[PDB]
Symmetry: D2
Subunit: 329 residues, 4 copies
């Protein structure tokens, strides 16, 4: 007498190597999850949240699509033991930006949540890289770094990877070029104080501000400054229209995860400690271009900013530090 | 202007899109289809259409902001169906969706009404497209789309039991310790409560599970494999109870079908089509049988061998669906 | 200051998904390009003994790095470059000439393996060995005996390709993509391979049940000719272009995908089948195996008809007759 | 009833014209590398191969067909008759004499012009609406020749040009900087050959001009000898050919990169061979590489790269060299 399985299969053999955990199964977390699944970045995906039904429903929905994926193990749970041995833990949990609301208003509430999340993550994946997505992402990357005790190369904020992607899309819409071939960087706060690096914007290595010196100024008859205003307002407008943002940030996060998981050493504008650059003296985290790989941030790229750009980046650091210094944890 | 100093134009002749896909409906199902199609590089232009103008624009913008990470260079939206012109494939997901405990068949009046306005507008602007119906009850709405469009039935395809079969193969794989890709088994009939598990065709590596386990699919089964089908039937209800709706699996299922159509693969999928003439069925009933899918839609039907009980269940599903289809007026 | 140090502030002074391909002949390079375009490795190492071809192939792949997502492509004539591999793919050795049987390669390629396998194993002691060189079933046995690895980690590419060819030919006959044409070729990757007619199906419909004479000498449709074309495929391609490469490279990348991504998909690969069908010796040939990050985790016990089982035992006798004459 | 007829009920009796058909002309090493790269990127729903060596053509076709289970291109065909190429959207020409050890690409010009007099009219006859992608060498001159013979508008006659040279440049840049080539930006323009031009003034990482940081970059006084990078670009093909007998993989991937931009209408910027009359002081009908926007109509636009006087003179010299050959045909 033998069961079906035992008549069909002779068992020979009785840890995951490319495991990714997503913390938070709100819209941002689930868009990160689906993007990472469709890019075949992980051999195991773990989801963690505190709403048990929603967590199970999202896990089941993904699992029902397994035939169409190449990620063979999808698990979930409220207990962080399900996250054990992750290479990469993506934290998207916490309060999310609402209509008309500054991401900076979320800071203390999400700091309080990180006091619980981060130690549990570190307990079960002491060797992982942390990719912070929750907002305000720059301050929460600082907080995650402080709580975790990790070296700062392994604490990465998704930062302005998305703002720069939005900038390159809008740039491409004006020039009739795919964003892949429109190069431009948004640095600083992932938020209202972000900094467009007009002096570096280029197609095929041609500096656009060299052709158009008014680029980025008020006197600009083409009003390129509106491009950056649209970058700043983008999240507010999408939130007002559909209630939240999800797809673009999910793709941005999966882009960062690809560079990390595959050790690509591509350059991304992500949140990291900038103390000692551009005359900044405090432990401020904000986005500068960094080399990203399997050890996290291995190097910073020292971008040459104009005086006007450097002043705006300092203003961004001052805004963040004004909030950072008043946190207790 | 800066653009003219930077760029020398050779020609400004904009041509018709070559691989355009439209998604009608920007609810959770429609957006899951859209992101799945975008990340599989199946379209060179994606159009979104719906009646909720704010949500439509917000979803469009959110996808557009991810363009750097995609290889689909044009993403458009509008309430006017002129944005959908010259689509190769139009995926209809709009309509009411089932609440907790609610049958897909309770959606008929609401979504037939919506289709009576959607389909003529789609056909007006993409007269050569394939219609991929996802809205529920999908088998009845595929019938409806066929009647209203006037298209040949090869170009009217219901997403049908592609998802039920995927779920079945997932649950098979969990029981056997095998990836669903290597677990073969078909759920046919209604995408709903009357679906039919084809026990006689379930296999791994060409080994019939029913041959090894003759009680498979019966009440005397000490392993209770019928509970696997029951889980398939209940899957959407359980997910809806937990997260309020389903989206990711159906989106991946639809992108799977769209891949076969857009790349002319001639893969076999269980999709909603007219099965008149099969198993001595004489009415124009639409339900899922395995179909060869390619760039012209359904090119062939596979004549699955069914046991007596399997065929009786399929006829019961056909009777349930036809009981509803026959009372529809066009 | 150097340009690099002016541009880059450094913060930080082993590969996690490394694949090595041994042999940079046409088969090895087809495996390499297929693996690279499937993004299966974060480091790819090429090893061979022909210094010039090796460096030339390495440089050619590197020059395409902008279009790939594998950031480290290395090569060498020594094993330093292979250290810490998850998967080592062995394609080196003599290949069959026009009209030459794969079994005629035994002496030459067994000799090569007695040098390659002991060294490979020293520097990647945890890798899976994927044998592609021919005769692959005999050489998988050799690699297992020599390496000291447990058998789950010594895998021959086997009949994965014969089955792919069978399903392609099936699909041409039936008007269906090979992905939807299901049928297995087992046994020797060679002239004694066994088509499992009794399992061939589309959408779970048994073709033999529809056509009980399928694949016999009574078959009016002559489906046996489909398997004959499978057996003869490599000979015909070698006669026409001199060698085969693309199909075997894609077949191997398919196996590497299942291993590297821990998919637990079923593939017909060369493994030890002692205990199946009453076979008593350490014969290696292809049966369907579940493939993942530990290599072969399970064997599928295919239900064979009397004639299919008899043909499989004939294949086993041919291989065993050669296997048992080898000394270690 | 036969087995097929017991199993399958045909609804459609015939197949429609292919919608995304690509033809590769020539099945030497370069042609087959293009074919496999295009197949593994899912760019075509039909691939046709043409050449004059009947046995090798059929063997290559069969070998690709035998891997069809692992691909998503359902029709692979071949023939000596160009009717097999009918209705291609893109025809890639790799046929003719290929560069040998020690051999200048320019030595191949007259032989390959002779071959194109037969190939191009046959291609045009069966695919009057295709784009032509010239890979055969010397690619710049043969792009000019294919344009004149075909009668096509120049937007539909594209030379693979310096897309590969630039990829090699960026690879070597990345090796020097420890950055993935995706994040190293730099253009090699002009002849796909010995007279190519490195645009030092445009090289950048994250929009930081390397020449601005390192003003000696590319000159003879350069203590870091970055000019050796371009020398390596120039010599790369010679070295690879000397080592393995030919080049194939990198050009195959480069062509598949161009084919992707064309087939998917991406409007990405690539340095490809086109007419540059009206730029940089060039008044002749010379074809050479400059950055072009590539899409479903082929080359729709050129990017007017800003050059130093020394870069511009080098590009004019490359143009003079090519024109001296072009005009003697
Ligand atoms: C002389 N004669 C007269 C009449 N019949 C005979 C035979 O000898 C004979 C002997 C055997 C068969 N067929 C099978 O063994 C099919 C096999 C099974 O049934 O296990 C099966 C494999 C795979 C699948 C699935 F699910 F994968 F598709 C389903 C079923 C047919 C005729």
């Amino acid at each position: 007498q033998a069961t079906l399985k035992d008549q069909l299969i002779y068992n020979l053999l009785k840890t995951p190597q490319n495991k990714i955990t997503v913390v938070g199964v709100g819209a941002v977390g689930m868009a990160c999850a689906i993007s990472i699944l469709m890019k075949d970045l992980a051999d195991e995906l773990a989801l963690v949240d505190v709403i048990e039904d929603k967590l199970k429903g999202e896990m089941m929905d993904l699992q029902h699509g397994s035939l169409f994926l190449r990620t063979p193990k999808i698990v979930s749970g409220k207990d962080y033991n399900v996250t054990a041995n992750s290479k990469l833990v993506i934290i998207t949990a916490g309060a999310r930006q609402q209509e008309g609301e500054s991401r900076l208003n979320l800071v203390q509430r999400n700091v309080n949540i990180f006091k619980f999340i981060i130690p549990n993550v570190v307990k079960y994946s002491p060797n992982c890289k942390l990719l912070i997505v929750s907002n305000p992402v720059d301050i929460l990357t600082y907080v995650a770094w402080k709580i975790s005790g990790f070296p700062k190369n392994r604490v990465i904020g998704s930062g302005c990877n998305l703002d720069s992607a939005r900038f390159r899309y809008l740039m491409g819409e004006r020039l009739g070029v795919h964003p892949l071939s429109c190069h431009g960087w948004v640095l600083g706060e992932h938020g209202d104080s972000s900094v467009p690096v007009w002096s570096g914007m280029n197609v095929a290595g041609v500096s656009l501000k060299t052709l158009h010196p008014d680029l980025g100024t008020d006197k600009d008859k083409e009003q390129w400054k509106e491009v950056h205003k649209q970058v700043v307002e983008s999240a507010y407008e999408v939130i007002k229209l559909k209630g939240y943002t999800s797809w673009a940030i999910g793709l941005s996060v999966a882009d960062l995860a690809e560079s990390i998981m595959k050790n690509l050493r591509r350059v991304h504008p992500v949140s990291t400690m900038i103390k000692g650059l551009y005359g900044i003296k405090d432990d401020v985290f904000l986005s500068v271009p960094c080399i990203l790989g399997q050890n996290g941030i291995s190097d910073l790229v020292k971008v040459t900013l104009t005086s006007e750009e450097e002043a705006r980046l300092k203003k961004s650091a001052d805004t963040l530090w004004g909030i950072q210094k008043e946190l207790q944890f």
